[PDB]
Amino acid sequence: SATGTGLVYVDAFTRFHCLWDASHPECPARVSTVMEMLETEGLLGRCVQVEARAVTEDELLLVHTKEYVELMKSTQNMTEEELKTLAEKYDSVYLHPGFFSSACLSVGSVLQLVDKVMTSQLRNGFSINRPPGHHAQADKMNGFCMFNNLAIAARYAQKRHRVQRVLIVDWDVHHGQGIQYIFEEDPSVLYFSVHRYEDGSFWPHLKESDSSSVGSGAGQGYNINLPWNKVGMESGDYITAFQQLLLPVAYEFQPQLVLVAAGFDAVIGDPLGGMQVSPECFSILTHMLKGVAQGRLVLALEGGYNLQSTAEGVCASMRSLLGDPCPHLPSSGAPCESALKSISKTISDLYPFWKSLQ
Numbered sequence: 143s144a145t146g147t148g149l150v151y152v153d154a155f156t157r158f159h160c161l162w163d164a165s166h167p168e169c170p171a172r173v174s175t176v177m178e179m180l181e182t183e184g185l186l187g188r189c190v191q192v193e194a195r196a197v198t199e200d201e202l203l204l205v206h207t208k209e210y211v212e213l214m215k216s217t218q219n220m221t222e223e224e225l226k227t228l229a230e231k232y233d234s235v236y237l238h239p240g241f242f243s244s245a246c247l248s249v250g251s252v253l254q255l256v257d258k259v260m261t262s263q264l265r266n267g268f269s270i271n272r273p274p275g276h277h278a279q280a281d282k283m284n285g286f287c288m289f290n291n292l293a294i295a296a297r298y299a300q301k302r303h304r305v306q307r308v309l310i311v312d313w314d315v316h317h318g319q320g321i322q323y324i325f326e327e328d329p330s331v332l333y334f335s336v337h338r339y340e341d342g343s344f345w346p347h348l349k350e351s352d353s354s355s356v357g358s359g360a361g362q363g364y365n366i367n368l369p370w371n372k373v374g375m376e377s378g379d380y381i382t383a384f385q386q387l388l389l390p391v392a393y394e395f396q397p398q399l400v401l402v403a404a405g406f407d408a409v410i411g412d413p414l415g416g417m418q419v420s421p422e423c424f425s426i427l428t429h430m431l432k433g434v435a436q437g438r439l440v441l442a443l444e445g446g447y448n449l450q451s452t453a454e455g456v457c458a459s460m461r462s463l464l465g466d467p468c469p470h471l472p473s474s475g476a477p478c479e480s481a482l483k484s485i486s487k488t489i490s491d492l493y494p495f496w497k498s499l500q
């Protein structure tokens with residue numbers, strides 16, 4: 143219904159895994175545990191089940207090159223040896239005979255929710271999809287990603303639904319450099335990423351993940367990086383960043399759709415992220431994004447590798463999508479010194495482009 147929260151999940155999302163590393167963190171259990179907890183918590187039944195669809199070539203070509211799409215399509219017929227040889231041409235990816243099919247459904251799941259939200263058939267929605275997308279680039283896989291789910295969804299919203307301005311909020315612990323690159327010169331898609339950085343020590347080790355990368359050309363000012371340079375950030379660090387930096391800019395930008403790269407590798411317990419964000423924080427962060435774009439908010443799963451922590455973070459976000467009052471958080475909400483240093487530096491780099499920051 144018009145006030146409902148959509149949810150997309152298909153079994154195909156479990157039908158690929160790393161053939162040569164049984165301990166690989168990006169695994170089918172990521173999504174099945176999310177679905178099991180959504181059901182256990184009674185949240186799944188409160189959502190509107192939305193069918194997935196496979197992305198089309200023309201939709202992929204909004205972001206990706208024809209040669210790359212064709213190469214990825216050809217992986218469905220490769221032997222394990224051929225898949226490994228190709229995967230090793232990229233940074234931090236594996237391949238599997240079912241990867242391409244699942245990746246196409248992963249993109250399409252987001253597009254389905256964009257359709258329902260933009261036409262007011264639903265208020266908001268969440269795709270419980272893998273593979274993730276935010277590292278994928280125009281002509282290459284990267285960081286467990288084949289196709290850039292949210293970058294495609296943003297250009298799709300603009301082409302099909304005629305949206306003028308899209309905000310992408312990326313709270314995964316990693317920098318979505320793929321999204322940054324795709325929209326580098328584009329003022330119609332504002333990209334905000336908060337991520338572990340540690341002066342480049344943390345993957346993907348890019349100079350352009352620092353706050354000095356503000357976009358270029360017509361896009362100058364429309365790329366905002368908030369790099370953390372110490373581990374152990376908590377809910378108060380994220381909430382403060384949203385209150386001091388993201389919300390003022392978002393209201394000035396006046397987006398017509400908000401897409402969230404909803405990774406949960408910053409949650410306490412993640413084996414890679416190094417952060418200490420409570421899952422309940424994501425109820426608050428989700429709530430803080432519902433006040434722009436008429437609440438037209440679509441979350442899509444990115445990273446998050448502790449099965450329980452990621453499922454808890456998804457559930458906390460879903461409670462806010464469904465309109466349940468936010469929980470009290472035990473901490474005061476005050477940030478640590480390192481977080482404040484990062485927030486202040488990002489504001490210093492972005493102030494020449496946002497009246498709300500001056």
Ligand SMILES: CC(C)[C@H](C(=O)Nc1ccc(C(=O)NO)cc1)c1ccccc1
Binds near residue numbers: 166315345446
């Ligand atoms: C070697 C290490 C640097 C690498 C790695 O951590 N990659 C990586 C990339 C993206 C995300 C993510 O969640 N992005 O949003 C998470 C992890 C890796 C590769 C294979 C098996 C384990 C670890």
Ligand SMILES: [K+]
Binds near residue numbers: 316335337
């Ligand atoms: K991020």
Ligand SMILES: [K+]
Binds near residue numbers: 332361
């Ligand atoms: K941009």
Ligand SMILES: [Zn+2]
Binds near residue numbers: 315405407444
């Ligand atoms: Zn991540």
